[PDB]
């Protein structure tokens, strides 16, 4: 009764035996592609040719054809950086936990579950349940102030 | 200017302060009543409502207390029967030592995990980690210094090629002047 | 007299008075100061610079030699004072123009190579510094530089060959100084026509392999460009919305929400990715080289936020109905505002945009009004009073300005104004009455020399009234005393004291008879001769260790400070991404272990809970907000210290920490603080305390490797199992700790699978998610003997919170793996089988309300994947000691098929029918059903999710006999026809349903007689479900390959010689429902007229078939294998309702709260002499409440 | 003046009013605490589980039960010690338990020895020496970075000077071979 249980022991964080590094392998994350991936570029003000060249430089650094062709889908730069950060955070959601990292808990598991149910663009849409007290005097003041400031 | 109306404001402020202090006294008496009146006496202590779970706790504890007490009296009656045997005294002293060791071993296991040795092993592991992080970042700084020295050697090669170009063009100008001053 | 009553939103902001705007540069600040303040003798330091600056601009007008380079090296130190005096005195030969032309000459490489050897690159460096010092000179200077072509001038040095990398770093500092002005950023993003823009030039420069720090400076320029671009797109969307609302897709509004959270995340990681690091600072993962000085990027992020009217945008977004209705817009803009309001610069930003800030306060307060106007504001939409907090924060900083600028006036003149000073102090004191206003006052005075205001006020009035009173009370002195006392008491960021702890102490020593100043001295005692560095934490630990006896005592209140200062200097702030780790946070932890810190924080926690345990029981619950804030600050600071110590020790390799005082003290501190909030929902600070407790309790689950799990000898002594013992054996210790231990053991365990994902999880992560649960189960199966006592003690309670928390744990803890699942389910089944036995013999089983609660637990467990299969693998009959479970299930079936008539049995039959429904549901399994190929076959997904042959036979028999017997309830019949609808989806369930209908042939007939006999408009749901079940057996005859025709169906309905007219009765009553009401009647007669058209389609009398073959099921896989191959993820873009049911509070008014509490009258006094002689309980209980009723250190 | 001290006393009075208002606000918040209309469930829990009478009786019963249980432990083991004979099964297992207790006590005393503390302090001082050696290597590495930067700046200045020399002599030779190819 009460079956015998064993675990496959592979969730430990990477680089645990820490085999020494290759000389000249710390400047590998400062290549043009590796920098553009951490920064991301914007299509609307980098141009067409230059955006193509930068996306090509980044692609041949990624090893996953899925992510390689999913690169830089937004026209904004910070949005591209955020899309890549979200891809990597989703990939690292469940990868770092278990044997040699803090085991899963209700708070962290609830967090990673609410992260998994989010599609790309990183948000699940909330439905209306309440609305503020519409004071169109406040709205008129806000619009007048915003327009005045936009003018001068 | 005049002090009449200002002193009037003063004394009406004093009466406002008196009203506020009396309201505060009312609040203090009220909170004292609200926070200290709840005290259970034998009248209610003899008719206390408890959950079914707490009542089952009480019943289980009573039952197992009765069973343990019964076995206890029984064992302590059996203790008075057994007579002194040499091996019995050997076992008595043996198990006295056994108990004392059972206690001293936990008293020492708590020292091994809460005493000087735990702090020392913690400092040791933290110093190992600090040194390993310092060295793992000095390795990256060494790679960046490799970058800088490659820049040095590239600039030095450019200096050499520019010096050879300057030398050859300078001697070329010298010879061209020494020719075309007598020829041209 | 000022109004001692306070309406917080009546006061509004005015333009800044003392602090310069946060986005204005140094030159603009100086020029505005010299403009408005007029011609003071501060002009002196200007003129000797100005006349010098114009003597260099008129001496090297056309000279470009070595002396010109040495003049370039000197100009940057004269542009701030000199050039400003020049520009405002309007003595203008266009010295700015000559400076810009000098700069363009200096950045020129052709001009550069015409210089001597030592200073041809000195000229380039000096021209770079000139760019950096002239771009920080207003729109005038930055447009002067841009018109002269500085972008394409700096991009000559960055693109030239054979150029020092330090010179490229300098040119990048210059480019970051140009684009820090919005004119520069516009000229950089959108360059001239027929030319690549500065951004395209930079992208082309990075695409060449650059030195590491050069490409890091390029990254730091690109991040700022992307921030400006996001702000510009937000401004565009906002102007679109403004024009559309003046005179809107949900897509663009979600895009605006994404852009707002992007602005937040970019401003959060700005001082690590948008600054220009020094030329000697390399981007190693741990800062080891280069200067420590960095330049914050917020004085330019605020210039961007200002040039794009970001506060006006958020005012609009909060005041426009369509966008303000979204919760995402409100939350995403409140994140940005709450981030801005953290720092002194961000808090001056709001007061520079004072009009936008007033309107934003109004638009935010409308939300916080309607929140409780329509909602209840405890678990719906979150309430944090951010409107009031921000109003009070900006108001106290306005008062700080009015209080500073009253000493710029009494030293340039003398006091003719006193009443406004006193009124400012009063309107600043009244803010400190709320807890939110007091927190805001304590947070604003704790920012960058703001406390210096009241400090210098008291230093003034201590030479004027000998401190408190000489001949006059000098009430301003008393106001300042109270204020610098409430800021020291309430602030948790104790950095402000680092530079002021001396001054205040002098004040505390300058007046020894002031009841408030000596309390402040007690507060500041740990700061005598302290330096706020990682070398003086031994002294702070020695202080906390020396007077730990005085914890909740006004004579040891300074200990709180010694735990804030010790949390400020030894605990790193929550790390952001892109940050390079500073190494002192390692040393601060080492020094925190050297001077005994694991001991003198465990002792702080132990005395903290030993003090709090009595007011907790006596329901005083930290009444006075002062004592509550000090005890919460002490608990949170000690917990942060412990968390950093343990998470820094247990990450430094696989280390094993077995103190075992930490979990035993934390499972009590949790009980005392985080367990029972009288509001029914944790606060913010108490939620942070609970999170710290759970994190520390989890740091005992690290360092568990294969070498620590081979044998039960090395598993039960592991640090994980020791923490689990200290958490579990602290649940059944005292009834006060029951709910705490449960609400904690439920926070340790992970949620139950499967994960609801929008995209596939690669097999490695689902393997990790399976293995961490296997490990939790491996460590819980050694405390099995305590888990059984927990699920035996609370199972059968009527306390709704404890009942719900046990019902949650028994799902979280039953879905870890097969061993713990079978453990929990064996315990619940043994509990119900010993409740049905032990009271009944030689006769039927006696069902009491204890049986009712026990069956309710078994029911609400059986509706989960793991628990239901753990039941199935016990009822099946493969005896491992499991015969009694099959017997008790047969007894429950006998109960349901023969309910009798009671109020208890009629309450238990509905629970057992809900059990039966959860057992016959194939959508409840570890291997979830899926018609997607490459998965388990459909018929082999039911062999592992439904009862076996001899159990399904009995279950169908019972589901029919409960329809035949008209003594059943309404909900019972509803759930039974639902179970029949479930079973009618496959040939297995339908074969058994038919084969059972061959014995009880009047089941559906009597059920229809019941439908018509007591039909009503609420009874319509049962009729709808029954007609759906009817169609579900005929929809195939016009998934399953074996069904009955309409003919033998109506034959089963044929037991009365008016059963067609019974259908007619149902019809005629159905049209007679209202014809005045909802879509019930039309859908229902649709269904039933379809059914009776199928009735007339064939002759009624037809015996049900007997030639049909049973679809056999394979051997049910061992529960361990099902837990191995379980569905770890499902592709669904919405949370499962069962998982979403674990997130709201366990305090439900009455939805699990039983109307029959069965509170058993117990006489406690007699239970003393029946046991061993004990104290008279009246005396013990009155010993506690007579004198000591105030929070904190009391009698006992 | 008269209105001078009049307004000063008015200031003292509004000060007293403000502090009394603060005390009244604290008392009102404490009332809202004590007169809170709490959830039915939290009231259920506070009345059933943390009720001081039931809770204290639970404490007393648990304490009495554990006292009786450890007393029964003492009596039973003393019995089995009276029933000890060297070749008894209980005898062998008992002396073996005492032997493994002696083994574990020797191990624990070893791990707590002054020799073990001395070895741990030696390892800690060795790690601190290694970390300060890493700091010295870091200072060497910083000075190396400074040298590299200074020399790349010097090399860039040299390159610029050489390029100027080269352009000068090159345009000289060019204009010479050009204007002297103009002469026959």
Residue numbers in the entry:
A (entry chain B): 1492 to 1643
B (entry chain D), D (entry chain C): 64 to 247
C (entry chain A): 333 to 579, 619 to 1409, 1428 to 1585
Which statements did the authors publish about this structure?
To understand the structural basis of the MACOM function, we determined the 3.0-Å resolution structures of the HWVZ and HWV complexes using single-particle cryo-EM analysis. To our surprise, in the cryo-EM structure of the HWVZ complex, only three components (WTAP, VIRMA, and ZC3H13) can be found, while HAKAI is missing, although it is present in the SDS-PAGE analysis, indicating the high flexibility of HAKAI. Human WTAP (residues 64–247), VIRMA (residues 334–1585), and ZC3H13 (residues 1492–1643) form a compact structure shaped like a “warhorse” that represents the core of human MACOM. Unlike WTAP and VIRMA that form saddle- and horse-like conformations, respectively, the C-terminal fragment of ZC3H13 is only one-tenth of its full length and contains eight α-helices, but it does not exhibit a rigid conformation. Instead, it attaches to the Belly, Chest, and Neck domains of VIRMA and functions like a barding to protect the horse body (Supplementary informaiton, Video S1). Therefore, this fragment of ZC3H13 is called the Barding domain. The Barding domain of ZC3H13 has a strong interaction with VIRMA, and the interface is ~4435 Å2, involving seven salt bridges and 19 hydrogen bonds. In contrast, the interaction between the Barding domain and WTAP is weak, with an interface area of ~256 Å2 in which highly conserved residues R1512 and F1521 of the first α-helix of the Barding domain form salt bridges and hydrophobic interactions with D206 and F207 in H4 of WTAP-a, respectively. Our structural study shows that ZC3H13 uses its C-terminal Barding domain to interact with VIRMA and induce the conformational change of MACOM.
